[PDB]
């Protein structure tokens, strides 16, 4: 398990605009936000950005 | 294996910190010295039924 603070989400968006860009076109459109972050932490994009 | 997340709007996180403080208090209570060790038991009554 990982704790995701709101300011952690804001700093993820600010430091990485790619995550906010993927957030804007998916979360209100296809799947909800916790599903989005569950998909993102299992993705190669997270490993590349880390 | 599986990944789980804790999405918070930074409002319940203060409550989570308070719960961690409660866990720390429980840790303090676990290592508490017994009352028969921190002070003498001579003046008190003898043990029994």
């Amino acid at each position: 398990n990982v704790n995701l603070s709101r300011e952690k989400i804001l700093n993820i968006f600010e430091n990485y605009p790619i995550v906010k860009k993927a957030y804007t076109d998916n979360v209100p459109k296809n799947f909800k936000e916790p599903e989005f972050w569950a998909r993102f932490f299992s993705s190669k994009l997270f490993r590349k950005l880390r | 294996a599986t990944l789980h997340i804790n999405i918070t709007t930074a409002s319940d996180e203060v409550a989570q910190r308070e719960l961690q403080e409660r866990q720390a208090e429980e840790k303090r209570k676990q290592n508490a010295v017994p009352e028969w060790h921190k002070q003498s038991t001579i003046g008190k009554t003898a043990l029994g039924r």
Binding site: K32, E35, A38, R39, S42 | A1, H4, I5, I7
Partner: peptide, 22 residues
């Protein structure tokens, strides 16, 4: 199949829990 299905049902369970809590 079981890792893919386990990942997607874990995601759906997390989504259901977080919609229930909100």
């Amino acid at each position: 199949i079981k890792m893919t299905l386990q990942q997607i049902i874990s995601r759906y369970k997390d989504a259901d829990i977080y919609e229930e809590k909100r």
